[PDB]
Amino acid sequence: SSVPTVKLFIGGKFVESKSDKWIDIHNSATNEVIGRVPQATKAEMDAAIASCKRAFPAWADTSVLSRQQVLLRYQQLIKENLKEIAKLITLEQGKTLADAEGDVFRGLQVVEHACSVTSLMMGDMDLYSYRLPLGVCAGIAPFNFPAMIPLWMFPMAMVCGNTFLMKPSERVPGATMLLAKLLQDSGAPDGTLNIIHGQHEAVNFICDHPDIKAISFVGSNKAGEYIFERGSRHGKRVQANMGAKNHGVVMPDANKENTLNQLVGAAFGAAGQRCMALSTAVLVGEAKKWLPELVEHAKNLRVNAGDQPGADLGPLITPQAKERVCNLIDSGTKEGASILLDGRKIKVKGYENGNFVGPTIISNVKPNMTCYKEEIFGPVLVVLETETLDEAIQIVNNNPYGNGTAIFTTNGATARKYAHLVDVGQVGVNVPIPVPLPMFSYGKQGIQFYTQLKTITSQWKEE
Amino acid sequence: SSVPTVKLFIGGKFVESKSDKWIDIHNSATNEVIGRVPQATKAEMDAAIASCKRAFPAWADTSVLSRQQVLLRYQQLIKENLKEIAKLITLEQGKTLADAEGDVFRGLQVVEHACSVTSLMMGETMPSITKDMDLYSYRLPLGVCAGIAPFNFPAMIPLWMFPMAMVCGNTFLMKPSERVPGATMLLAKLLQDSGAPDGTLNIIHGQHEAVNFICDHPDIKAISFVGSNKAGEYIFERGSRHGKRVQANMGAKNHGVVMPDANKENTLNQLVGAAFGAAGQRCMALSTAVLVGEAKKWLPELVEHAKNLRVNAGDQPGADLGPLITPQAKERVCNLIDSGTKEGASILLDGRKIKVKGYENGNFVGPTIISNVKPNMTCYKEEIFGPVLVVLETETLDEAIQIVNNNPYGNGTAIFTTNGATARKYAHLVDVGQVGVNVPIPVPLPMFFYGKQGIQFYTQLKTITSQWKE
Numbered sequence: 001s002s003v004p005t006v007k008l009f010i011g012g013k014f015v016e017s018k019s020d021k022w023i024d025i026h027n028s029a030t031n032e033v034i035g036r037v038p039q040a041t042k043a044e045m046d047a048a049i050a051s052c053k054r055a056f057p058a059w060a061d062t063s064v065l066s067r068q069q070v071l072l073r074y075q076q077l078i079k080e081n082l083k084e085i086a087k088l089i090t091l092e093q094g095k096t097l098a099d100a101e102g103d104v105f106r107g108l109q110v111v112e113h114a115c116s117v118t119s120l121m122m123g124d125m126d127l128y129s130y131r132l133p134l135g136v137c138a139g140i141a142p143f144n145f146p147a148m149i150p151l152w153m154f155p156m157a158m159v160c161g162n163t164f165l166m167k168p169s170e171r172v173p174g175a176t177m178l179l180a181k182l183l184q185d186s187g188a189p190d191g192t193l194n195i196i197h198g199q200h201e202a203v204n205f206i207c208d209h210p211d212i213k214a215i216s217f218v219g220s221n222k223a224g225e226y227i228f229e230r231g232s233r234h235g236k237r238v239q240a241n242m243g244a245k246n247h248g249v250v251m252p253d254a255n256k257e258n259t260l261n262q263l264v265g266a267a268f269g270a271a272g273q274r275c276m277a278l279s280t281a282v283l284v285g286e287a288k289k290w291l292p293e294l295v296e297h298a299k300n301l302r303v304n305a306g307d308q309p310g311a312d313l314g315p316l317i318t319p320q321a322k323e324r325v326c327n328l329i330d331s332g333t334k335e336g337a338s339i340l341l342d343g344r345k346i347k348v349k350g351y352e353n354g355n356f357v358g359p360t361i362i363s364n365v366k367p368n369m370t371c372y373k374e375e376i377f378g379p380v381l382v383v384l385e386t387e388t389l390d391e392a393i394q395i396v397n398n399n400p401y402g403n404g405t406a407i408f409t410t411n412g413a414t415a416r417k418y419a420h421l422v423d424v425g426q427v428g429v430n431v432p433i434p435v436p437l438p439m440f441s442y443g444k445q446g447i448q449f450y451t452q453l454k455t456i457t458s459q460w461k462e463e
Numbered sequence: 464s465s466v467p468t469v470k471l472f473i474g475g476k477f478v479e480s481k482s483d484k485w486i487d488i489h490n491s492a493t494n495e496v497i498g499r500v501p502q503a504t505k506a507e508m509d510a511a512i513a514s515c516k517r518a519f520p521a522w523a524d525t526s527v528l529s530r531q532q533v534l535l536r537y538q539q540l541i542k543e544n545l546k547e548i549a550k551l552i553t554l555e556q557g558k559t560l561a562d563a564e565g566d567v568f569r570g571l572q573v574v575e576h577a578c579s580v581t582s583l584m585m586g587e588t589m590p591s592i593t594k595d596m597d598l599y600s601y602r603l604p605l606g607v608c609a610g611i612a613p614f615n616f617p618a619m620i621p622l623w624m625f626p627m628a629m630v631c632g633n634t635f636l637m638k639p640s641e642r643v644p645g646a647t648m649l650l651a652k653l654l655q656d657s658g659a660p661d662g663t664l665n666i667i668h669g670q671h672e673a674v675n676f677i678c679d680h681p682d683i684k685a686i687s688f689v690g691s692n693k694a695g696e697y698i699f700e701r702g703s704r705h706g707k708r709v710q711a712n713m714g715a716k717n718h719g720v721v722m723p724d725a726n727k728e729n730t731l732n733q734l735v736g737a738a739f740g741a742a743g744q745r746c747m748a749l750s751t752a753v754l755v756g757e758a759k760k761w762l763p764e765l766v767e768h769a770k771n772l773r774v775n776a777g778d779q780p781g782a783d784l785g786p787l788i789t790p791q792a793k794e795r796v797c798n799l800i801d802s803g804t805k806e807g808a809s810i811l812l813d814g815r816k817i818k819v820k821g822y823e824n825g826n827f828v829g830p831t832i833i834s835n836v837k838p839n840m841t842c843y844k845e846e847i848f849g850p851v852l853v854v855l856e857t858e859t860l861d862e863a864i865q866i867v868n869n870n871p872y873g874n875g876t877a878i879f880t881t882n883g884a885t886a887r888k889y890a891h892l893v894d895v896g897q898v899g900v901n902v903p904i905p906v907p908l909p910m911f912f913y914g915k916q917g918i919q920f921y922t923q924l925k926t927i928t929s930q931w932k933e
Contacts, residue, residue: 232703255933410931419601419927429929431596439926456890458900462726463881 006037006173006197008044009180011051012190017044017197023170028094028315029305029354035092037170040196042205048194049211052136052163055191060133060161064121067159073186075111078104078151081182088174089147090306094314094354097306099270100147106436107151113443114155120447121160128456133161134237135213137450138206140167140227142219142243143317144275144377145437147175153216154183154193156442160450162214165194167206171317173197207231214450218275218438219243220375221401239449241438243275244401245375248432249392249418251409252286255430259408260290264297266432267381268359271313276404278432279376282384282392291363291383295341298359298381303343305351313379315348316355325378329360332371332382338364343379367398389414397423404434468499469644469668471507472651474514475661480507486641486670491557491786492776492825498555500644503667508676511665515607515634516682518662523604523632525660527584530630536657537626538574541567544653548618548646555643556617557785557825559777562741563618570622573913577626583918584631596930602922604632605684605708609677611698613690614788615745617643621650623913624687629663631921636665636683638673642788678702685921687912690746691715691846692872710920712909714874715746715846720863720889723756725879725901727764735768737903738852739830742784747875747907750847753855753863762834762854766812769830769852774814776822784850786819787826796828796849803842803853808833814850838869860885864892877905 003024007014017038025035040048059067078085082104089100123129137157141149146169157164168176180195196202203223206212207230214237217227224242231238248266250259266278283290304311316322326344333339343358360380365371371382386392396405406428407418419427425440442449466487470477480501488498503511522530541548545567552563588599608628612620617640625635639647651666667673674694677683678701688698688711695713702709719737721730737749754762777785787793797815804810814829831851836843842853857863867876877899878889890898899905910916 258932415929419925420603425924426926426928429927430932431928431930434928435926440924452896454890454896454898455906456898456900457902457906458886460901462729463901 003033003036006035006177008040008048008197009177009193009195010044010048012184012192014177014181017041019044025092025171025173026318027091028317029307029351031319031353031355035174037173037197039198040202045196045202045205048165048196049136049209051191052165052194053211055189056133056135056163059158059163059189059192064119064159067161068115070186070188071111071115071155071159074183074188075108075115077182077186078108078111078179081178082108085147085175085178088178089172092172092174093143093146093317094306095270096311096314099314100306103145103148107148110148110151110437111155114159117159117447121451123453124459124461126458126460128454130454130456131451132454133451135162136165136211137162137214137216138165138167138212139215140203140206140217140219141169141176142275143169143171144219144243144273146172147179148437149218150176150179152437154179156446156450158188158192160447162450163192163194165196165206165212167202168195168197170197170199203227204230208234210234213237214239216240237449239441241275241403241441242401243375244403245280245399246276246278246402246404246406246432247392247396247399248278248281249284249396249405249407249409250281250287250290251284251389251407251411251414253410254408255410256290256293260294260297262408262432263294263381264301264359268298268301268313268379271316271357271379272377273317275438276433276436277377278406279380280372280382280384282386282395284386284389284392288385291340291361294383295361298341298361301359303346303348303356303358305348305354313359315351316357316378319355321378322355322357325357325376325380328370328374328376328378329362329380332362332365332369335369335371336364337362337369337371367395389418393418393421403438403440404428406430406432406434466496466499468501469648471501471503471511471668472648472664472666473507473511474665475655478507480668482507482669488555488642488644489789490554490825491788492778492822492827494790494824494826498645500641500668502669503673505676508667508673511636511667512607512680512682514662515636515665518660519604519607519634522629522634522660522663527581527630527632530632531578531581533657533659534574534578534626534630537654537659538571538578540653540657541571541574541622541650544649548649551645551649552618552643553777555645556614556788557777558741559782559785562777562785566616566619570619573619573623574626577630577913577917580627580630580918583915584922593930595932596928599927601925601927603925605921605923606633607636607682608633608685608921609636609638609683609687611638611674611677611686611688612640612647613746614640614642615690617646618650620689621647625664627913627917628685628921629659631918633684633921634663634665636667636677638667638669638677641668641670644668674698675701678707679705681705683707685709687711689909691848708920710911712746712911714872715748716870716873717747717749717751717875717904718863718867718870718873719749719752719876719903720860720867720878721752721754721758721761722860722878722880722885723758724881727761730879730901731761731765731768733903734765734852735772735830739769739772739784739850742787742828743850744788744848747904747909748848749877749903750849750851751843751853751855753857753866755857755860755863759856762811766832769812769832772830774817774819774827774829776819776825784830785827786822787828787849790826792849793826793828796847796851799842799845799847800831800833800851803833803836803840806840806842808835808840808842808853838866860889861892864889867893867895875905875909877902
């Protein structure tokens with residue numbers, strides 16, 4: 001009758017929430033409610049913070065080797081229960097089983113990397129370089145890679161000696177809850193990790209509470225800047241990889257078939273619901289003639305539920321995103337954007353009630369049009385036209401923000417020129433996704449962030 | 464005389480400043496005008512930025528080995544021109560010859576350290592991560608950089624700041640202090656003599672308007688500043704607004720703690736040398752001290768030692784502390800001492816009425832020791848920036864640690880004791896990164912700037928993923 005509720009995580013126990021506000025988790029494949037996520041109340045969040053504070057000293061006093069072994073056990077458990085995580089992802093977010101498994105494998109690789117770190121966490125002029133932890137940390141997850149967000153923050157935040165208070169995606173909490181259950185089963189001390197669900201109000205609380213020494217967030221630029229400002233206001237550490245559009249340049253000498261295939265796979269893969277999604281492209285020179293074949297390749301994609309075989313792309317997380325992308329495409333058409341493929345009114349047999357949206361391609365887009373300004377975060381690929389490499393480079397640089405940029409070409413001179421003159425953190429050559437996840441502002445940067453330094457100097461020979 | 468002006472340095476020529484607004488440089492020992500520093504106009508700053516941008520590409524494409532050679536020749540010239548820089552510093556800033564010598568010595572040491580960033584500038588690569596797929600990262604300069612130094616350390620701070628941006632491949636626009644630009648001009652001349660490509664370094668002089676320009680201009684990528692807390696916070700906020708990365712040392716407050724189980728004579732000597740050292744004008748000055756236990760009964764010995772300090776001009780011998788930076792600084796120090804006295808703090812030692820024979824016109828202020836200070840008093844909250852020592856009375860180490868923690872912009876302190884457990888307790892409880900043990904100043908080298916961290920700051924990473932399959 002009543003769908004199950006999403007439990008919290010305080011003091012090493014999945015306690016139930018007393019809040020009255022509940023959000024229904026609608027299955028993106030059929031819009032069927034499959035869960036209920038509550039909004040953490042003030043008392044619940046205060047108890048979570050108290051548990052994190054009480055666990056901080058004990059967890060920190062332990063040696064780096066104990067935390068390393070705990071994280072190794074957690075990684076082993078994840079590897080054992082990878083199929084469960086994949087099924088939970090395909091159920092909640094509707095992502096394909098293959099893409100979910102790949103995401104879980106990437107998260108496991110990130111965890112392993114976090115484990116491979118050496119004793120670096122420790123670090124008459126007797127001097128020391130003790131790098132002590134910060135304290136109670138927190139994190140906010142977007143709707144792109146919810147199951148993987150905790151796998152980025154928990155390993156480093158813990159091995160560094162800090163307690164974490166996670167804010168998972170209220171619309172995809174199952175994956176994070178399963179990951180936390182596995183972590184607890186790994187043998188970690190009770191109270192080391194805590195989890196609370198909520199909305200913008202919860203983000204405000206987290207950014208306002210003083211005990212929160214650091215916070216990490218990824219997603220839209222608006223929320224990113226908002227969290228950055230509200231955190232810097234309270235004088236606490238903040239780091240966020242702002243989501244941005246990626247521009248995939250295509251030279252005429254590049255491999256036409258392979259380039260088109262990779263573009264159609266990256267842009268429309270998982271309905272473009274990736275922060276590294278290649279939502280934009282630039283056809284240089286004769287590449288303009290590839291629009292018909294690009295549309296054909298896009299059509300060749302097989303739309304189907306994430307749990308069914310042969311599913312190349314899944315539906316949108318929520319119907320609100322479908323309405324948003326529809327309105328964006330309508331505005332683009334009104335402004336004069338020449339659309340070539342329209343998958344908005346797609347009716348997937350057996351799942352018409354879902355948020356499925358077929359591949360969409362748009363050409364003749366200009367930098368001043370809303371299509372180039374607003375982030376689609378959907379199965380839409382806006383195509384631009386240029387006459388020379390310099391034009392494409394300038395167009396890509398004009399973008400206010402960008403995480404990754406790809407250029408398909410076989411000439412080494414052109415590739416090097418593009419990679420050197422471009423102002424993007426990550427540059428890919430013949431690869432639409434330079435890195436599976438945004439590394440540009442973690443690894444070394446994460447170690448430097450989640451820790452501090454005390455240069456204890458002493459000249460104590462006389463006494 | 465005509466009070467020779469401080470000409471600018473744009474491109475490969477020391478172009479004269481056409482600005483109408485000028486500031487007269489006064490000698491702190493006699494308050495006599497010795498020079499006129501210009502207030503760079505919009506056109507001059509635009510020309511300097513254009514020169515920096517035009518020089519950037521050639522300096523970046525140049526091999527790092529050539530930049531290291533240039534820095535080596537510059538350090539050699541500094542070694543040769545040590546005495547000249549020391550004399551210019553003693554003249555303008557008013558410090559003692561020994562102070563300027565040590566300043567240039569630390570600058571040269573940091574330059575030498577930076578000269579060995581060759582291995583650090585090298586990138587990394589992983590061959591064949593996937594079939595016919597490779598990965599490699601390139602470290603590249605940020606672009607054009609800027610520097611804003613305080614009235615203290617006109618040679619050490621630039622020598623710590625700009626050479627890193629140079630070796631990293633960036634162009635630097637140094638904004639020297641409004642009060643002591645001569646040393647910076649001499650350093651720039653020496654650098655130009657080192658064979659550095661013209662246009663790589665540019666210097667402009669001006670008031671807060673210059674800082675506003677440097678922070679507002681978009682071409683500027685990174686900005687560095689050292690000095691007071693207010694100016695540092697303002698510059699950091701403006702850079703964050705305009706997107707400029709700013710690294711600033713604003714926690715200039717420093718506290719000293721002395722336990723009864725410590726070397727009395729040596730601790731007192733070190734405190735007297737650090738607090739009143741160079742008239743206590745340096746940012747990282749130990750102008751605050753917390754006396755615990757028998758330190759209260761030792762305070763008389765501290766005053767006796769402070770009385771031994773000979774207030775005399777730097778040019779003359781026996782100079783332990785020189786005159787203040789400006790007469791307004793002396794007025795402010797006197798006002799702060801008077802406020803502390805009115806607030807009930809006993810002035811165990813007074814130096815306001817000091818009169819150096821032959822240099823009364825200067826801004827000389829003798830050692831001042833203030834006791835009975837409390838957290839609610841102004842002398843504790845306000846930064847003195849002078850030869851004044853505020854002494855707060857506490858009973859246990861916990862009280863001193865709490866007093867230190869009450870000052871968040873206090874990233875610097877030291878503890879004097881003999882027990883290792885006490886030192887560990889002080890290091891842990893105190894929320895300060897630079898914690899010293901039986902040392903007056905905890906490694907004057909400040910940071911949020913230099914070393915490998917400096918390279919990371921003045922450089923960026925570009926992850927390149929290339930798969931030349933076919």
